[PDB]
Design a protein around this ligand. Structure first.
Ligand SMILES: Cc1cc(CCCCCCCOc2ccc(C3=N[C@@H](C)CO3)cc2)on1
Lengths: 40, 255, 59, 59, 273, 57, 255, 40
């Protein structure tokens, strides 16, 4: 129950439960498959 | 992009990668397997330690120099002291095993040299004395050290003459046994998978060795100018599908 | 660092040995990295020993 | 003895056989690990569990 | 539910009262196996003997004390009680300890209540109103050195601010590293020849730090902190023999030497009533 | 969720542990690519490492 | 014609027969079982030597005399040196096991005496010094010898006072732990099956013992007239469902 | 009504109403019937 009118006044947000490290761990242009050779 | 050339073998808790392989040999085209009931005789249930014995043990390294004649290890002897493989070995009456052997030797594109890596089932050695002199136990159970074919004749030991395979046959014909070459220009490792080969379903691991692994320089090592004149050779071996049976008190063996 | 809770050791040795080509010399180096597997869990947040201060900063 | 680009480099010697390249314990919150991003984040939490990935790039 | 059924005379070959205790069992014998009984009902459920109930009331687990005074020229705040600290633990006081050690492993959430009262043992014009700040300093996180260190910023560490005379209350989930807390541990932290034995090595919970936020007034004020702990969501495994001798140390089973006989001697014979 | 799957001996031409870090990627290698593993579950969600939680006290 | 009285336990390559048993206790009514995945944490495949470790080891015998106070063994310590069980123990980082304990003591229908045989999960001992003196490692790792409660206090050792269970609780209440009596007039053996009890799924076998087995004379031994005044007590124990994990170099432990 | 998000913050648990002393009072391997002889 929100007792207040504005959105800033609500409690903390709830877990992204998004999670996708590939923008950080695999930003390569041509896709690399694990097990296939790195450099062909 | 798979090449015959790069390989990974993972066995137990240990992994080997080679980026310069030349395929791998599987003796007699058979892969190690456990002992089927139809072939069984001893009524005892066997023990299969699995991953604690079926991992890769790297023996101490050898040094190939221009004067090297070749080295010889016996199995299961070479592993008589490796981790739990060895304990199991001394503690059961009977045991059985296959192996993956990986011999390693890297150099550069200026070196030349070529080793023969061969597995000989039942390699009965000859006494250098001739006649019917026997080869004492200790001499055929060198352990991880193996036998150094360029060491001197000793008394009660085997002959160490390379053109004769330590038994009255010519080096040239060893190629009838499962084998692979390490030619610095091609190759940097050799891998052979050994299935269990015997005339009985299971045997004693201490009174009888069932294969000798032999690494022999054939085209002499030739290093580039002002290079150090030697390369180390390393042997890593992994028991596979090992089974032990008839547990008890723990064998005591000569020396 | 807890004892009961300790994780082991990591070592590295020559398996055969490094070999340099002709006309080349000296030491070569390895770079080493560390990251966590997708396996990883971290819990019970607290303050880091890695940062402290003695007076408030100002502009 | 003072922070340098050189403490990122593990040296290798040509022609040594059998010998040891480096050693470290695995207290990820201390010692070598401590300034790495992993080490640095682990320090915001009290407990960790999971697998680590250690890689070496040859130069 | 019947507490006793009706049962009459017996002349059988089936004797429920003869057993062999050597077996380790306690055979479930009832009044009606050996006398003639009448029906009666239980009228009772055994509600208040549930382990959640047994361990579920607040018990005092710790009393500490800090003072508000001029820190000018104090070389060791910790030592002046300018801010004490407590090595969280649950065996320092014994009423609750004997209760928990009736079990080997125990798992529960904790609800803490902290009461703080002030004392002014020497001449003051008044009673000041102090705010206490208790911080959770788990192991690996900077521990406070002065009563007003950067540590107290507590940007990542839960802290509660309440007034002396009031009470603070919050609840912490089960923070154990394993599946349960060990009430006992017959081990070491490693195979060392001289390492300590016991749970001291296992119950590594870190400590909790208290301080007054107020600067000093002209008089000195003693604030005494009492921490109460209530187990909620209790789970207990493997019952053990109750504690008979007195306790000597947090975390070891050790009892004092030349202790006194714990079994009351009869005033009379074995035959005495 | 499985934290580790069961995996046994390997003798392949497919080596997931050899990579080229020069590329800028961190290849997602797991325990089961290089030792023999058994199944285990995560039992955990990563709740308390959410940025809302990290900056939210 | 089955009696509670006669029994046979066959485990591995070893069998025990008792013709005068008093049923058998299974701690907390649970039988030893392997570690399920849902409960697993370490990702390593475990090793299950089976019949080579799950057999019966008979520890050296004790002598009950009229002055005996009782003996105490810790598990897995007591077995730290038995055959391949012990090797596995020193060689893996973690291991887990349940046991069958069989305590034996026979006499004649003229003797009297009664022993309590009890298993205590997590038996943390007390220092006889009091205060917060610790009990050094060696003292809580007596090996097959176990601890002799009628031996003298030693320094760094535990207290050996029987009315207090070596921990501040009364002998009389040990009956809350799985236990069985050996009453010469009834019984001649005691058998207890111990499931693995811990707060973690698998643990170290050397830094933590998870049960102490305790044999305590309670009704003093009384031999017939002009009989020798003593009886031997023998303890035989068999690991069951053992699993080892995290193999490596081989622990080195104090003393 | 829980006012709080985390489970630790809820009140005491509610009676097991489990109750089974046999793991403690009768951990024998072969079942003993009351009335039948203890040792056969
Ligand atoms: C502000 C503020 C302060 C705190 C404290 C957080 C609580 C942490 C304590 C965790 C529980 O601690 C223990 C310690 C020991 C035992 C225990 N020892 C054995 C006898 C049995 O149980 C159980 C819980 O949190 N926020």
């Amino acid at each position: 129950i929100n007792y207040y009118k504005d959105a800033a006044s609500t409690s903390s947000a709830g877990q992204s439960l998004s999670m996708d490290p590939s923008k950080f761990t695999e930003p390569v242009k041509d896709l690399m498959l694990k097990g296939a050779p790195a450099l062909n | 992009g798979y090449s015959d050339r790069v390989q990974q073998i993972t066995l137990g808790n240990s992994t080997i990668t080679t980026q310069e392989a030349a395929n791998a040999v599987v003796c007699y085209a058979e892969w190690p397997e456990y002992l089927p009931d139809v072939d069984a005789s001893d009524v005892n249930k066997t023990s299969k330690p699995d991953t604690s014995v079926c991992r890769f043990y790297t023996l101490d390294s050898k040094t190939w120099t221009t004067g090297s004649k070749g080295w010889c290890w016996k199995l299961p002897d070479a592993l008589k002291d490796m981790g739990v493989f060895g304990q199991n070995m001394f503690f059961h009456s009977l045991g059985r095993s296959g192996y993956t052997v990986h011999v390693q030797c890297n150099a550069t594109k200026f070196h030349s040299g070529c080793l023969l890596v061969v597995v000989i089932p039942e390699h009965q050695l000859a006494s250098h004395e001739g006649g019917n002199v026997s080869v004492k136990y200790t001499f055929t159970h060198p352990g991880e050290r193996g036998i150094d074919l360029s060491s001197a004749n000793e008394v009660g030991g085997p002959v160490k003459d390379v053109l004769y395979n330590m038994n009255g046959t010519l080096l040239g014909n060893l190629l009838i046994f499962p084998h692979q070459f390490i030619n610095l220009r091609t190759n940097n490792t050799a891998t052979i998978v050994i299935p269990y080969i015997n005339s009985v379903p299971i045997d004693s691991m201490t009174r009888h060795n069932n294969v000798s692994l032999m690494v022999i320089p054939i085209a002499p090592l030739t290093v580039p100018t002002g290079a150090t004149p030697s390369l180390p050779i390393t042997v890593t071996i992994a028991p596979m599908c090992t089974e032990f049976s008839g547990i008890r008190s723990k064998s005591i063996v000569p020396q | 660092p807890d004892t009961y809770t300790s994780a082991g050791f990591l070592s590295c040795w020559y398996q055969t040995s490094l070999i340099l080509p002709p006309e080349t010399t000296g030491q070569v180096y390895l770079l080493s990295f560390i990251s966590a597997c997708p396996d990883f869990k971290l819990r019970l947040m607290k303050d880091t020993q890695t940062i402290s201060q003695t007076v408030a900063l100002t502009e | 003895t003072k922070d340098e680009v050189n403490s990122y480099l593990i040296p290798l010697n040509a022609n040594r056989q059998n010998e040891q390249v480096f050693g470290t314990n695995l207290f990820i919150g201390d010692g070598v690990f401590k300034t790495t991003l992993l080490g640095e984040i682990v320090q915001y939490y009290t407990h960790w569990s999971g697998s680590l990935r250690f890689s070496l790039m040859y130069t | 539910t019947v507490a006793s059924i009706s049962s009459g005379p017996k002349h059988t070959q089936k004797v429920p009262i003869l057993t062999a205790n050597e077996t380790g069992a306690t055979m479930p014998v009832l009044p009606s196996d050996s006398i003639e009984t009448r029906t009666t009902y239980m009228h009772f459920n055994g509600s208040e003997t549930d382990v959640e109930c047994f361990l579920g009331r607040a018990a005092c687990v710790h009393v500490t004390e800090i003072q508000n005074k001029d820190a000018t020229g104090i070389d060791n705040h910790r030592e002046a009680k300018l801010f004490n600290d407590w090595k969280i633990n649950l065996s320092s006081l014994v009423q609750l300890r004997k209760k928990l050690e009736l079990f080997t492993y125990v798992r529960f959430d904790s609800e803490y209540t902290i009461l703080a009262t002030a004392s002014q043992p020497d001449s003051a014009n008044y009673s000041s109103n102090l705010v206490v700040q208790a911080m959770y300093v788990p192991p690996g996180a900077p521990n406070p050195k002065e009563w007003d260190d950067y540590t107290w910023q507590s940007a990542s560490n839960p802290s509660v601010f309440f007034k002396v005379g009031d009470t603070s209350r919050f609840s912490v989930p089960y923070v154990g590293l394993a599946s349960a807390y060990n009430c006992f541990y017959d081990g070491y932290s490693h195979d060392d020849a001289e390492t300590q034995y016991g749970i001291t090595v296992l119950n590594h919970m870190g400590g909790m730090a208290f301080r007054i936020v107020n600067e000093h007034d002209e008089h000195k004020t003693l604030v005494k902190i009492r921490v109460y702990h209530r187990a909620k969501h209790v789970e207990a495994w493997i019952p053990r023999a109750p504690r008979a001798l007195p306790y000597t140390s947090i975390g070891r089973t050790n009892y004092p030497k030349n202790t006194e006989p714990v079994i009351k001697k009869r005033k009379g014979d074995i035959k005495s009533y």
